[PDB]
Amino acid sequence: RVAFYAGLKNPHEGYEVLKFDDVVTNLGNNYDAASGKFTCNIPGTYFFTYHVLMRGGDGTSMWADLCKNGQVRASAIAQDADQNYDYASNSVILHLDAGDEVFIKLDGGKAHGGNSNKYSTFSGFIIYSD
Amino acid sequence: PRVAFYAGLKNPHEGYEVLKFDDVVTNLGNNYDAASGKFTCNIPGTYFFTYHVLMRGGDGTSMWADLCKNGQVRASAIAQDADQNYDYASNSVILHLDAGDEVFIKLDGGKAHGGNSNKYSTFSGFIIYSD
Amino acid sequence: PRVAFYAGLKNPHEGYEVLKFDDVVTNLGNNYDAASGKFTCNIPGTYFFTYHVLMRGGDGTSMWADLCKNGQVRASAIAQDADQNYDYASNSVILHLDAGDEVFIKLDGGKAHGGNSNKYSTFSGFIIYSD
Numbered sequence: 001r002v003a004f005y006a007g008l009k010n011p012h013e014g015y016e017v018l019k020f021d022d023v024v025t026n027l028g029n030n031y032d033a034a035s036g037k038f039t040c041n042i043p044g045t046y047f048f049t050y051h052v053l054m055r056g057g058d059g060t061s062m063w064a065d066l067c068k069n070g071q072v073r074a075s076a077i078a079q080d081a082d083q084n085y086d087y088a089s090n091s092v093i094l095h096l097d098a099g100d101e102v103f104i105k106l107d108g109g110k111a112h113g114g115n116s117n118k119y120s121t122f123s124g125f126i127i128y129s130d
Numbered sequence: 131p132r133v134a135f136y137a138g139l140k141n142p143h144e145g146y147e148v149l150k151f152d153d154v155v156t157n158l159g160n161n162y163d164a165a166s167g168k169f170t171c172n173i174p175g176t177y178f179f180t181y182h183v184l185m186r187g188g189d190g191t192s193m194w195a196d197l198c199k200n201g202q203v204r205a206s207a208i209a210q211d212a213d214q215n216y217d218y219a220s221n222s223v224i225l226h227l228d229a230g231d232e233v234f235i236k237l238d239g240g241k242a243h244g245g246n247s248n249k250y251s252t253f254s255g256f257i258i259y260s261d
Numbered sequence: 262p263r264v265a266f267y268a269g270l271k272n273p274h275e276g277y278e279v280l281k282f283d284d285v286v287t288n289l290g291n292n293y294d295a296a297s298g299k300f301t302c303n304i305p306g307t308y309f310f311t312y313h314v315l316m317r318g319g320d321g322t323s324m325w326a327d328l329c330k331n332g333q334v335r336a337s338a339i340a341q342d343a344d345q346n347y348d349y350a351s352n353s354v355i356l357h358l359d360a361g362d363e364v365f366i367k368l369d370g371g372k373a374h375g376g377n378s379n380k381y382s383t384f385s386g387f388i389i390y391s392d
Contacts, residue, residue: 001259003176005224007205024204025224027176027259045265045289047387049180049222049311056210061347065379073286074269075379079318081344082212084191089220089351091311093267093287093385117206123224125178125258127265127387128289132390134307136355138336155335156355158307158390180311180353184339213343215322220351248327248337254355256309256389 002028002042003125007118011055013110017103018052018064020122022115031124037103038124040096048102048124049091054078055110056085062109064088068102078109085112093127131173133159134256138249142186144241148234149183149195151253153246162255168234169255171227179233179255180222185209186241187216193240195219200232209240216243224258262304264290265387269380273317275372279365280314280326282384284377290388299365300386302358310386311353312366315374316340318347324371326350330364340371347374355389 007022019036031038038048054062061079065072076088096102104122111120138153150167162169171177185193191212197205207219219242225233235253243251266289268282281298293300302308316324322343328336338350358364366384375382 001176003224003258025176025226027226045263045287047385051207051221053208072379074383075381076313076349077315077347077381079346079348080211080342081346084210084212085208086210086217086348087207087220089349090313090380090383091267091385092380092383093265093387095287114206117203118221118223119206119208121205121221121223123178123222125176125224128263132307134355134389156307156357182338182352187341211342215341215343216339217341217348218338218351248334249352249354250337250339252336252352252354254309254353256355 002030004031005123008113008120009115010113012113015106017105022118037101040098040100042126042129043098044129045127046096046124047093047127050104051087051089051121053112053119054086055112057083059110062088062111063107065105065107066090066092067105068094069100131257131260133161133173135162136254139244139251140246141244143237143244147237149237153249168232171231172229173260174228175257175261176226176259177255177257178224181235181253182218182220184243184250185217186243188214190214190241193219193242194238196236196238197223198234198236199225262388262391264292264304266293267385270375270382271377272375276368278368280368284380299363302360302362305359305392306388307390308358308386308388309355310364312384313349313351315381316348317372317374319345321372324350324373325369327367327369328352328354329367330356331362
């Protein structure tokens, strides 16, 4: 039983890993709010999905990619020339070995983080155990 | 247990209200009710939910749609476009639910698209684990 | 049973056609066919599908992408931006499938992005229940 869901509490920007630290669900305790990383304990096939809200007001574009051990497994862009809010979102199904890390990383731009409203999110669960 | 649903919004809505997804495609367990717009948990456990609400085009610039558990925000989303283009308010959650708990999408400002059968605006969910 | 797939689009496409996601990451059950872009049901049951299709930026203002079961639309989505910005057509369904049923994403007008490694445009699904 492994499943998690968390929101961004704070704004982040640039090329950093997103620390989703408004934790709603964390069965198995394999997601780490301090780092923003899911670290596999139970090897198997996993679903992950993410929804990152681009900060409105300036910068035009924002990129957010889902990485496995630092390697891109899905990418997303949010873009609006009038500086409107928009979302960078995607979903994956991956294999994870014990120790494998999964996280969302910015690749330019500004994401909003809201102190309780869970606009920007990250979730995942195990589909099959190896 | 077999508990899963998928429904589209058949009519436009623009109020501060629960979105009644009434184009029901799937409803194993029949825990989703098109009349209220709500999924009511009857088997405690862990559930996945996702929603995709299309903002009405050519008529306004912002729309908000939130997923609630009982009446409480568990995810929020915004669609925004200064040129009144179509755009989506979309998000996904994983929640633990108790018997009698309700999960649903509330429109929280702005105008949403609903239509007869194309299922542009949607709501789905399924149980991952039984507790 | 194990039935689960995730694939990305390697290759630009446009118009009115089945999107053939060809960067196949996961394909347990071997029921997704990159050559046709179709998932063909082997094990009758209840299935989750989701898709995210990136509209090409800098060239066009609207793009439609629909999830179909056999001939039939079961979810629709639109990307639209008057300034030709990148934006996504994305939606999710839960469907019952009989053996032989085909599920795929169809472009319904407009231009989609595909590229080699980044997987901006994606299609995934998995069985939730066996009949």
